[PDB]
Every structure is written in structure tokens, then in C-alpha cells.
Design a protein around this ligand. Structure first.
Ligand SMILES: O=C(O)CNC(=O)C(=O)O
Ligand SMILES: [Mg+2]
Ligand code: NI
Ligand SMILES: [Zn+2]
Length: 331
């Protein structure tokens, strides 16, 4: 068995290996990368996503989100308070202000210490989930707006044609902006490219151990657990590495820098934080190996998780017994 300790693997494809996206994902899995739940891909030195980032300031963040925490430093939830619209140039200036800017630090480990000590005492503002792309149309390799669609994969594997579309999303971050513990919708893959700015630190639980994280979460968030049998689908709960270690939960960590891709694998729980002003692009995708995970994915039916149009068909075809209840949740 390849990668039996489920370590995060880092890949350096050549420009020739960067041509065929599906083939390279399958290669990474042949080396055991999926066992970690997360892999890093450093693009060949010849590649670029676009020529410059000098002209992005007029992108609008229609609904910036202030991430307000409740709980203790290592075990907290966050809710998202909607703020007034602002441009990316306006948001960058805000991120760099004395109130929000990254503090002085020695190295990534010192900054990580400061994050977990102090996150709950601040409310950073995140520009999340903005439909769009920063890849140039002429970038032919690993262009996250030109991937094979999940609808087409389901049709290729299972023969059923379904409605729905699959487009990327932009994220503009600042110091302490936080992504809560989650797997993807329908336990899909994700791919995330950090276009510019400061790093993103990730934490991940191997897919084979995901239920250990879920059992801890039910213990740590007991009210939320009674409310919903899949409350991590709400994407609001944080648990620190110290607390994970105290409870014996297997996990790994890695820091993504500008110019690097991360891939999350089916049923790989992940969480993390931004180091300072940055911009990322991410999208979900599927492979043949995903289908069995899609069929077994948990679902939120309490009404909180509310998701895209295109998840309807995935539930309807892969999970017909659950469909009626899940759709009641959506309506
Ligand atoms: O970058 C973020 O805020 C969160 N991203 C992801 O969870 C992802 O790419 O799967
Ligand atoms: Mg612009
Ligand atoms: Ni994710
Ligand atoms: Zn729910």
C-alpha cells in the first residue's frame, strides 16, 4: 500500500506531465497521495496562470463576510456577518490597515502559534465564494475554469445525463480569515490555486479516519450535534491542532504559498487560515473513484447547509432514498 502513514505529498510535474489533468491526478493517487486527504502541486517553472495581477482592483466583493467567533481558543464556532460591498482594491487596503494586518512574526510556525492563541479575539473580513476566474483564457494547462465538469463525469461513468453546471470561485482573504472543518459537497474533490499574496495554512484528516474527527466534533459541539446529524456541513466549527493531538485524532498540516495548487480528496476533512491579504481560486471536480464516495456522502437536511443548484441532481441520482428528506431541507 502506497503512503501508509497518510502523509501530505508534494508533486513537481514537468511541463509535459502538466498537459493531461486527469492523468496526473490518477498518477498522484497511484503513489498514495489521496490517503492524506490533501496534496500540493508545484507547477513547472514554464507555466503561469496569467501575465500579471496588476488590474484586479475593480473586482467587486458584493457581500464581504465578518467572521465572528464564539467559544474557547482551541474549540470555537464562527458566524458570518454580512458587510457592505467593496472592491478588491478597497478590501486590500482594509486587510493592510493597522486593525487587520498580519503582526510581526518570526516564521510560519510563530504565526501559527499566534493564530491559535488569538483568533477568537478578532473578527476578520473574508471575500468568499465569488463566482469568477483569474486564469487567462489562453492558459491551457490546469486552468480551473476549463476542467471537465462533474455532470459530464457522472454521465460518462453512469450513463445518466443531468442538469447543472460547475464553475470556479474566488476567495479574497486577510490575516486570520478562517475556513472551518469540512469535506466538500457530496464528498467531491477540490482544487485550489493561490493566485497572489500571503500564504494559506491547511490542516487535514486522512479520509480513512474521517469518522474519528466526526466523533470528536459531536463531543465538542454537543448542541450542534443534536440539531443535525451532519452539522460539519454547516462549515462553522474549528478545532485546533493542540486539541486534535490531545484527543488522538490523526491529521497533518502544510502551508500553501502563492503560485501553488492544493488538491483535496474525497472525504478529506480540512480547515485552515490565511496569513494576510491573498486571493485564491477553487472548484470542485470528480474522477471515477469519487462515485463511491458520492453515494455514501452524509447530508445536512436540517436546513442550515443550503447549497448550489447542481447538488440536486447528485443527490437525486446517487442517493435516491435520501432525496425527499434532503430536498425538504433545501425548501
Ligand atoms: O480557501 C478557502 O477559504 C477554503 N477552500 C477550500 O476549502 C477548498 O479549496 O476546498
Ligand atoms: Mg479589476
Ligand atoms: Ni474545501
Ligand atoms: Zn444541518
Amino acid at each position: 500500500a502506497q503512503n501508509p502513514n497518510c502523509n501530505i505529498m508534494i508533486f513537481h510535474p514537468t511541463k509535459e506531465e502538466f498537459n493531461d489533468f486527469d492523468k496526473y491526478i490518477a498518477y498522484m493517487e497511484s503513489q498514495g497521495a489521496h490517503r492524506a486527504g490533501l496534496a500540493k502541486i508545484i507547477p513547472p517553472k514554464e507555466w503561469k496562470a496569467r501575465e500579471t495581477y496588476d488590474n484586479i482592483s475593480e473586482i467587486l466583493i458584493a457581500t464581504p463576510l465578518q467572521q465572528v467567533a464564539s467559544g474557547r481558543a482551541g474549540v470555537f464556532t464562527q458566524y458570518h456577518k454580512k458587510k457592505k460591498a467593496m472592491t478588491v482594491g478597497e478590501y486590500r487596503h482594509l486587510a493592510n490597515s493597522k486593525k487587520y494586518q498580519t503582526p510581526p512574526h518570526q516564521n510560519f510556525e510563530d504565526l501559527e502559534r499566534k493564530y491559535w492563541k488569538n483568533r477568537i479575539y478578532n473578527s476578520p473580513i473574508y471575500g468568499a465564494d465569488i463566482s469568477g476566474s483569474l486564469f487567462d483564457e489562453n492558459t491551457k494547462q490546469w486552468n480551473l475554469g476549463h476542467l471537465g465538469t462533474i455532470q459530464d463525469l457522472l454521465e460518462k461513468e453512469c450513463g445518466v445525463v443531468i442538469e447543472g453546471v460547475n464553475t470556479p470561485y474566488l476567495y479574497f482573504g486577510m490575516w486570520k480569515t478562517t475556513f472551518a472543518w469540512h469535506t466538500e459537497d457530496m464528498d467531491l474533490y477540490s482544487i485550489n490555486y493561490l493566485h497572489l499574496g500571503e500564504p494559506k495554512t491547511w490542516y487535514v484528516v486522512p479520509p480513512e479516519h474521517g469518522q474519528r474527527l466526526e466523533r470528536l466534533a459531536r463531543e465538542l459541539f454537543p448542541g450542534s450535534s443534536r440539531g443535525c446529524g451532519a452539522f460539519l456541513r454547516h462549515k462553522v466549527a474549528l478545532i485546533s491542532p493542540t486539541v486534535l493531538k490531545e484527543n488522538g485524532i490523526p491529521f497533518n498540516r502544510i502551508t500553501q504559498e502563492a503560485g501553488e495548487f492544493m488538491v483535496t480528496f474525497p472525504y478529506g476533512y480540512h480547515a485552515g487560515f490565511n496569513h494576510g491579504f491573498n486571493c485564491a481560486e477553487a472548484i470542485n471536480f470528480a474522477t471515477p473513484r469519487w462515485i463511491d464516495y458520492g453515494k455514501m456522502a452524509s447530508q445536512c437536511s436540517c436546513g442550515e447547509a443550503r447549497v448550489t443548484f447542481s447538488m440536486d441532481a447528485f443527490v437525486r441520482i446517487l442517493q435516491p432514498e435520501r432525496y425527499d428528506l434532503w430536498k425538504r431541507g433545501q425548501d
